[PDB]
Amino acid sequence: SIQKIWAREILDSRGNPTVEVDLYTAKGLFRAAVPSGASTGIYEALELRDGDKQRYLGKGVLKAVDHINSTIAPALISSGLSVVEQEKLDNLMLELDGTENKSKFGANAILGVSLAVCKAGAAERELPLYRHIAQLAGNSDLILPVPAFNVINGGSHAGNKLAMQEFMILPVGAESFRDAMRLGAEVYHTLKGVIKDKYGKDATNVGDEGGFAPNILENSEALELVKEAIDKAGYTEKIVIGMDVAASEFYRDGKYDLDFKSPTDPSRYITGDQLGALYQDFVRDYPVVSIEDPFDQDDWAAWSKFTANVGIQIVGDDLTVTNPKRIERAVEEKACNCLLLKVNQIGSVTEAIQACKLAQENGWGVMVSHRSGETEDTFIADLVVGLCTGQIKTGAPCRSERLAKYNQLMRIEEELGDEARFAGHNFRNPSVL
Template sequence: MPSWECPWLSAKLGVPLYRHIADLAGNAEVILPVPAFNVINGGSHAGNKLAMQEFMILPVGASSFREALRIGAEVYHNLKNVIKEKYGKDATNVGDEGGFAPNILENKEALELLKNKIGKAGYTEQVVIGMDVAASEFFRSGKYDLDFKSPDDASRYITPDQLADLYKTFIREYPVVSIEDPFDRDDWEAWKKFTASSGIQVVGDDLTVTNPKRLSKAVSEKSCNCLLLKVNQIGSVTQSL
């Protein structure tokens, strides 16, 4: 279907475009998504030592999108003050995606910052944490290098199972409910095992790149339980659906 046909059909039917798209997808109930605020950056998006790319807050307990937006903005700006006090003024520089990029090495330290800030702001019951690991960035010869921004040293690489155990530690100790791209895009077995055992939302982005063949494989092998669709990777919303 050409990109113009979907809006043309929605106009012809006299329904909003979002409603027509929902009908095409067989979705009877339309809701606004919970916004994900990217507040700490690492990986290739920042000049710090963090291996994992994005640490996000998700205001899942907000009563409306407006309230979720307010909570996200409030936590983001308060986090800036905390980072400045703990790491200095230079630490409030932002990465490519707009999150802060304090010069910390341990991914767990980023989670600790978020957990404490969420708690002090009084949003423990309303805000949870999501991560975009972008693990393909630090995949090395079947293993993973969580210090990939330092000179290469194969002795520090960890196995997919060890990385999965690290994620499960994060899930136990912090309100982490969503992890995007936890493994390399071709580490299918690790994806499948983690999705089956983690109990959280496991998002495929680099895994599928909105490619129909990779999407089909991910679904059939149950490699993830959530898909991130990027229209720019396939051409149109209709093709994505």
């Protein structure tokens, strides 16, 4: 049983408060922290903030902390359940909150406990966390994911005009996860020089996720810079490109604004059809193999149309919000073919595992993801390996809220020894390996 829980406010990678939970068992102290998005979908579970303008401009999380310390902790201690019992403990908290969207305690309160319970459960089983998560999920043969590194940041994550949020490189042809890290970092460092030589050293500062934040508007230009760096590093055959458009961020009165960080001028807005044609040009002109959130979270007909007209991976993020109800609708409508898995969009480990299994049972890919506000926590590294999803995005190889996960995936690969397998070109469907 749980001996004691103590939660506190720490600061995330942008300097904003977030929740951290210490949980004590006879095995010792286990600690987890909760991430926080910036381009947050409207259907995400509630992130409870205090709203005290006198403190962190209203962004404290003292209310979430107190719900954990004073209500959730005695509930879970009273239950007497072992920390191994992830589903029972998560269900106790979902029932005690009692709301659909976790609006009584906050998804941040519930998740911080859910994650700390999962870490203590792995220790109680005397297993690494990724193996405990594999058993929770019913998986046997574990696989390292292809990392998807967001090397040029735009949208709501960067100070630039560039509207689309993330331009990622995926070393699908690497030999191992450790080799994927070398490929990704070499391209990233090559790209700093490509940008410096063109735009100047002032275009080589970074955005929230560690990608460069060059002063450019045109999304094709970000793609051209990434392709140039791939080729200059000598990895044209081995590295492909993914995008996260985060189109909900720039959806305006049924159109889309590719210059949404410039003062509002509706004459520049474009139709979903124009925007889809742009994506088709990108897929033709560059090695783009994955596009996430190409349309707004409510623009279902545009998603179904586009997915039917391409052969690449199309990832639901704000469309699906890690939420079985929304995933079912996206399956029915054939809106996308991959789920972005964010524990804090739904609020518990159990529910996230269920969302992952639901997408996998319907033949979708699943890409585990960080949030743009991260912490030193590395849980998602063990999560993607235990869930065997084959693909994770958790930052450029820059800023250690990103590298902490990448470093942990290198450690897991080392630990697996001869048993390690890398998803490679099977990142959409690694269950075949």
